[PDB]
């Protein structure tokens, strides 16, 4: 955290700072803190757990020279949420980013999930009313075709009325707009990275949402940048 | 021996490789069972 | 509060969870047949009821046959609950009539309401779709020891699926032949005077209508079991999790207890 | 117009069809187009249906046939085609098994005209 | 067996079993009046085997590329792998094998659950022909199990099929004591599995299948196993060939 | 002798208890599953007793056995109760001599428990 | 907090969060060596918080009436309002309103679980204008959970309240930084216990407050000056509300 | 709670009262999960019963008043005795749950069913 | 176990030990255990309890002078089979028979729970391929039951396809029983003792030639010539 913190006061850049695991700094914590002889606390965690935790987290904070982001991996001893560890650590996270094997399954890189993954500041206030409402139909859209899955799994899809099957075509290629080919794992993909800006994704979507693209393929989306790069690979697709 | 067994008959002889459902109507499993003022005197196939 | 009862307990919902699901998916995907049974039954029924239609045939001017249509089958609602009421209520005015049931998940009702008027009963049938040959032997029973052809009215009980989320108690007549022949607008069809045609179509039109009020009757129950157990598997998840987070409630607090003894008993 | 009907599978509805030959309890009479309405019962035999000039010929399991006053057919059976249909393990331990038994001698008239 | 991984060679050590190692460690602290943690280990209980394990590991070239693998061995109680001493080694170790009671006496031996016990290296360390073959087994039976329940009434297609394979892929994953088989012998009967050749086939004479095909192979097609033993890679003829020496003990 | 009316009824209602297990939805009994449940119900009732009213050695040996030999049965549900006090009432009036002979003997023998099977279904009817 | 009160002033003391200090008390604790009671908690954890929420309180005439008002914060775990600290401050605080995360979720904001909240003090610290709309309203909705629970067979008279309590509770939907006047909310609580929104459907229920507001602007500005000033309904208002509302 | 202090009657009354409502605490999760449906009609009947002894036993308080606005009403034990009493031999099977939720005598019942019914 | 010593070694012959109860003496350390001045261990035991049971068991071993056969009856606190009193136990016994409060509330005796009872004298090349082979089935035909139970309390035996196999489950299970002559005032029923080669001759027959007699027939019976007399007595 120290090495983080000189990008930040001697420089003032936007510092990313990784622990993983972050699970292990409270175990390890509390090891030190039994063999020093105090009191296990509850679930026979250290007494100083909330502290502990404290004095590094607060550390990683937004100055007037720059800022310092940490992504830290946490674990959740026996899935439970309630466990002093968790409970605790959570209370300094802002947002998630989980990555399912089930996103994997359906070769999406990254593999994100668009459900579990939610952010603190997904808000009208921060990001703006305009990239809020279009986030919103996004999520709500997708989270209406997972609960589709259960009747197209028996029936078919003729099942679908108008305005059932107009938004399940969205789903289809919204689903697969969001992986995006890494410019690190060029080496190995062979595909040439393309980094998406923000400005671009909140337009990029919001003009799918209305219903401009629905004549484009849904392959046109698979692995791809922007939404320009949808519209090129549309037309060498027809060749 | 009733109008429906005289097509009942003929409808086992249409089981004549590639019959599908079409063998979940070949046979089935009922038991009939009479009844007393309740009391039900011995329950028989069909 | 036990360190186990509460994980095992945690056990014997966790997998009802799953398993009433499971027989959602079963009742889903068994709804293609139902849904197809019924309108087969249906058009058959409209081609078998036409001629009865073009003849004007009905009820001569005090035995009457009540035959139950049902499974043994529970779990799938209030369709054995519903129906049974409906023929109650329909003997209430007549309770001069002898009752046939079918399945034994209506013979529960009417052994309550009204044990004696119950002489005869079949066991083991809802599980499948319906076949002709069953109802025909049903027919053929029904004709035999109950002698249906001596009766002056019949009355088939089913279930009718008027809408794929709610069913609905419906009642069907059967004409015996003398209540064929004798049909105002009978002579309107050319039928040779010899061959027993009355007398063979009633015994057929006896076990077609059973089929085709089964394969209905059978047809809204799968389609009320899916709804039966689409609220479980969604009650059994207010229990998977709820008695899941009262597990840890006592994990944790079996882990904290059980260390307290230890730092209390080492002050000495 | 023809109406052929079974419990499991509907095969015409209100379908326009130029003549049928059916197989009633007396002898197989082709239905013309307005026929006299009449209530005939039918025995296993084959159902021919003329879809203009076209020839569709079905094997039926045996049921009842009705010519409406609207010159509209029903014919309805158990089970009915002919490229989609030997049992002779029947003549002996089913014919000869007289004590279902006792008229266990129905089996032997449907194979027979099957062939045919 | 450090020693080994020092001078360029490989070794392989079983710790039978861990369990019993922390209690005996707790035994120590206990006495020597030294401060208890949860469920009596001391605070160094995680330590203790994180010392260990870590010290197995392959070298790189640099040194002599030896390497020191560890299987270590857990005695759970009751089926409770979430206790201090159980999750600690397991958050250390790069996968678990996991065995089960119920397929124990089912007849499933060893009784591996898949569903859990995952290798976290796993395709990397396989033997490529191996790879091959049973790319798909792994997710075969992940869906098997979930589908084995529908047994209690009928079948559509797409999911009476997978309820054929499963049903008698574990059959062959049976295997009795004492009896380890070589790669060379594991493709020809995973290759049957995978692709489908023992669909057909009455589980009841599914064991002695294993023998006699083996049998077969290593009398008339002694050539086919020796390549895939020495080479360990199935090559477009190879395979090709394989599909065919299968399909001919199918009808015999 | 009360050894005798209860060979193995203890074992009996053990396994009366796992019945009503599957008894709840409302399942068609058989022949192995109705004769149980109707007689493992009503020796519930049978069993239950009243504070501050402790019942003699010659006073549970015919309860007990009008239960197990079979003859309860036939009695309705919520007549149970009733017919401990009822019975009781019977003995000592009429069999007398069989109640004396429970408390002095203390063992039943082939003669007194072929006289109390039938003194039993003597008040079964009327 | 306490200057305001002894000085016949008023103030609002708000601790948050209170779980967290008492996490926070039980560290020293532990470090001293003292027995370790539930959940790990000290014996005088009740004690902490005991003498602590008791100096909030509505003074004396004589006093000065000063008052003191305390809002006390409790994060749960998973919901569970059975734990020791959370049960410890219930027990002293009078009065609660959970937020259930459930309705969160839904929108339902605040998500307020009209089952587990009350206050101690209905019509004695509520305005009497509101306590005339609100017929019990608590009760309606606390009950009205069982109707939207089961019948998930229509109905025809329970079933009617189910279109009643659904737009009623939708109606109380408020944004953040969103406060309302005393006269601003006690005429939707008024077009609930009668049904009076039942035409409008599940869309712009919101939209009529943003409407209906505008109509007081100046249409009925008489209105809003009445409420505001005195705070108690009338015969006279009473009659007058029944006609300024039904226009919509 | 003995039959020689409160009475044979007042004793079977309670009595009737706790044996019926075990049946329905013994069946909170079936009909959580699964249903009234899947219970026998002699079950039924009892667990109906039961979801009116219960709420039946509620009662508004005088001091209450001040958050509840509901009146508090007090009854007497002989009241109580009696009025239990004929519920569990099913003298109001046919009137709504709702009737008998803070309430005062089973007169008060009646009142309220019928203020409900129109 | 020093008087046992001694017939071992210095006396050269076989030895036959019985303890009752074993549970005792590891209990009994754990009373000592505090007041001798130790910090307690987990469940409130000794911190010396692999040990201490080690130093016991370790005596009772089958050496080159003589051999020990060695039955001991182990106590599980509460029926709790993670108490590191029985726990410890279990990895020092070669064969084991566990009992459980389950079974005998079935009618069975003796109350021994058919899966968790395991020796490892289970061998194909101890007991005899045979003796083995009928040993896994007896052994498949139960588990299902434990898991397949979940559909028989919600609907029972109409689902079953393995419809064969889940009944024999409720007519093998019952065969196990055995009389003793010991228990004489608990059931009054004659004991009976079979042997070794009977009692697999009689399990591979039934794994379903003996589907015809339901319930009772194969309950408190002798080795398979009883089960032919009982069958007999039409019950």
């Not at chain 3, 043994?72 to 046939?100: E, F, M, T, W, Y």
């Not at chain 4, 309405?37 to 009842?64: A, D």
């Not at chain 5, 099929?161 to 049903?167: D, F, I, K």
């Amino acid at each position: 955290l120290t090495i983080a913190e000189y990008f930040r006061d001697e420089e003032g850049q936007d510092v990313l700072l990784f622990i993983d695991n972050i699970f292990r700094f409270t175990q390890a914590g509390s090891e030190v803190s039994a063999l020093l002889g105090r009191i296990p606390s509850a679930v026979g965690y250290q007494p100083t757990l909330a502290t502990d935790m404290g004095l590094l987290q607060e550390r990683i904070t937004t100055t007037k020279k720059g800022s310092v982001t940490s992504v830290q991996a946490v674990y959740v001893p026996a899935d439970d949420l309630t466990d002093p560890a968790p409970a605790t650590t959570f209370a300094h996270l802002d947002a998630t980013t989980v990555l399912s094997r089930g996103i994997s399954e359906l070769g999406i890189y990254p593999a994100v999930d668009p459900l579990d993954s939610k952010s603190r500041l997904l808000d009208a206030a921060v990001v703006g009313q305009e990239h809020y409402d279009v986030a919103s139909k996004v999520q709500e859209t997708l989270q209406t075709y997972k609960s589709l899955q259960d009747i197209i799994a028996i029936l078919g899809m003729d099942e679908l009325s108008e305005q059932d099957k107009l938004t399940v075509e969205r789903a289809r290629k919204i689903q697969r707009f969001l992986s995006q080919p890494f410019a690190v794992a060029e080496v190995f993909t062979g595909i040439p990275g393309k980094l998406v800006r923000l400005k671009d994704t909140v337009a990029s979507f919001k003009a799918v949402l209305e219903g401009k693209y629905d004549n484009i393929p849904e392959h046109a989306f698979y692995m791809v940048g922007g939404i320009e790069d949808v519209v090129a690979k549309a037309e060498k697709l027809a060749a | 021996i009733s109008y429906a067994a005289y097509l009942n008959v003929a409808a086992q002889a249409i089981r004549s490789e590639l019959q599908t459902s079409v063998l979940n109507r070949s046979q089935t499993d009922a038991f009939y069972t009479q009844y007393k003022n309740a009391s039900e005197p011995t329950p028989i196939t069909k | 509060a036990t360190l186990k009862e509460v994980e095992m307990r945690l056990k014997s919902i966790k997998n009802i969870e799953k398993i009433t699901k499971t027989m959602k998916i079963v009742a889903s995907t068994r709804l293609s047949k139902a849904e197809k049974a019924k309108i087969s039954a249906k058009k058959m029924d409209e081609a078998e009821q036409l001629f009865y239609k073009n003849a004007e045939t009905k009820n001569l001017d005090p035995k009457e046959l009540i035959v139950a249509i049902t499974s043994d089958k529970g779990l799938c609602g209030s369709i054995h609950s519903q129906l049974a009421k409906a023929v109650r209520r329909h003997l209430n005015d007549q309770p001069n009539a002898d009752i046939v049931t079918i399945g034994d998940k209506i013979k529960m009702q009417l052994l309550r309401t009204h044990p004696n008027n119950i002489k005869l009963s079949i066991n083991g049938i809802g599980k499948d779709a319906p076949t002709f040959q069953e109802s025909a032997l049903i027919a053929d029973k029904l004709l035999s020891v109950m002698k249906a052809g001596t009766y002056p009215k019949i009355s088939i009980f089913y279930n009718d699926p008027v809408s794929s989320l709610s069913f609905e108690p419906s009642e069907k007549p059967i004409f015996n032949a003398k209540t064929i022949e004798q049909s105002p607008s009978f002579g309107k069809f050319e039928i040779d005077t010899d061959a027993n045609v009355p007398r063979d179509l009633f015994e057929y039109t006896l076990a077609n209508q059973m089929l085709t009020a089964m394969a209905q009757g059978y047809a809204a129950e799968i389609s009320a079991r899916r709804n039966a157990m689409d609220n479980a598997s969604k009650n059994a998840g207010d229990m998977i999790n709820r008695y899941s987070i009262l597990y840890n409630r006592t994990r944790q607090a079996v882990i904290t207890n059980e260390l307290v003894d230890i730092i209390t008993g080492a002050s000495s | 117009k023809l109406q052929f009907a079974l419990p499991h599978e509907t095969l015409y509805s209100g379908s326009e069809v130029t003549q049928v030959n059916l197989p009633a309890k007396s002898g197989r009479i082709g239905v013309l187009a307005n026929h006299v309405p009449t209530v005939e019962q039918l025995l296993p035999g084959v159902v021919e249906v003329m879809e203009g000039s076209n020839s569709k010929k079905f094997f039926i399991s045996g049921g009842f046939a009705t010519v409406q006053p609207d010159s509209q057919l029903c014919v309805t059976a158990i089970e009915a085609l002919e490229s989609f249909s030997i049992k002779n393990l029947l003549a002996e331990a089913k014919k000869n098994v007289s004590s279902e038994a006792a008229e266990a001698a129905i089996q032997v008239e449907v194979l027979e005209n099957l062939q045919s | 067996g450090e020693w080994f991984r020092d001078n360029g060679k490989h070794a392989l050590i079983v710790y039978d079993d861990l369990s019993k190692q922390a209690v005996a460690y707790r035994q120590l602290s206990l006495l020597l009046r030294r401060p208890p943690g949860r469920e009596a280990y001391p605070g160094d209980v995680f330590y203790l085997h994180s010392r260990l394990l870590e010290r197995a590991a392959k070298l790189s070239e640099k040194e002599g590329s030896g390497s020191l693998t560890a299987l270590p061995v857990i005695e759970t109680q009751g089926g409770d792998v979430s206790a201090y001493i159980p999750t600690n080694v397991i958050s250390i170790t790069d996968g678990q094998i996991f065995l089960e009671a119920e397929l124990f006496y089912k007849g499933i031996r060893p009784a591996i659950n898949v569903g859990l016990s995952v290798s976290r290296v796993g395709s990397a360390a396989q033997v490529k022909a191996l790879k091959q073959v049973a790319g798909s087994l792994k997710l075969f039976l992940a869906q098997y199990r979930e589908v084995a329940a529908f047994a209690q009434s009928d079948l559509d297609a797409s999911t009476k099929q997978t309820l054929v394979r499963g049903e008698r892929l574990t059959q062959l994953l049976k295997q009795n004591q004492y009896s380890p088989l070589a790669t060379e012998e594991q493709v020809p009967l995973i290759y049957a599995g995978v692709n489908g050749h023992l669909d057909g086939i009455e589980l009841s004479r599914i064991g002695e299948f294993e023998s006699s095909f083996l049998s077969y192979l290593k009398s008339n097609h002694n050539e086919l196993l020796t390549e895939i033993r020495e080479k360990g890679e199935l090559s477009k003829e190879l395979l090709a060939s394989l599909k065919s020496a299968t399909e001919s003990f199918v009808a015999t | 002798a009360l050894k005798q009316v209860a060979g193995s009824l203890k074992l009996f209602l053990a396994q009366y208890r796992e019945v009503a297990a599957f008894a709840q939805f409302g399942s068609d009994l058989d022949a192995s599953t109705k004769q149980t449940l109707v007689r493992g119900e009503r020796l519930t009732q049978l069993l239950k007793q009243n504070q501050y009213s402790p019942l003699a050695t010659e006073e549970q040996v015919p309860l007990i056995y009008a239960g197990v030999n079979g003859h309860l049965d036939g009695i309705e549900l919520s007549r149970i109760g009733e017919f401990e006090s009822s019975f009781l009432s019977y003995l000592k009036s009429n069999h007398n001599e069989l109640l004396t002979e429970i408390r002095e003997k203390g063992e039943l023998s082939k003669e007194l428990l072929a006289s109390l099977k039938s003194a039993t279904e003597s008040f079964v009817a009327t």
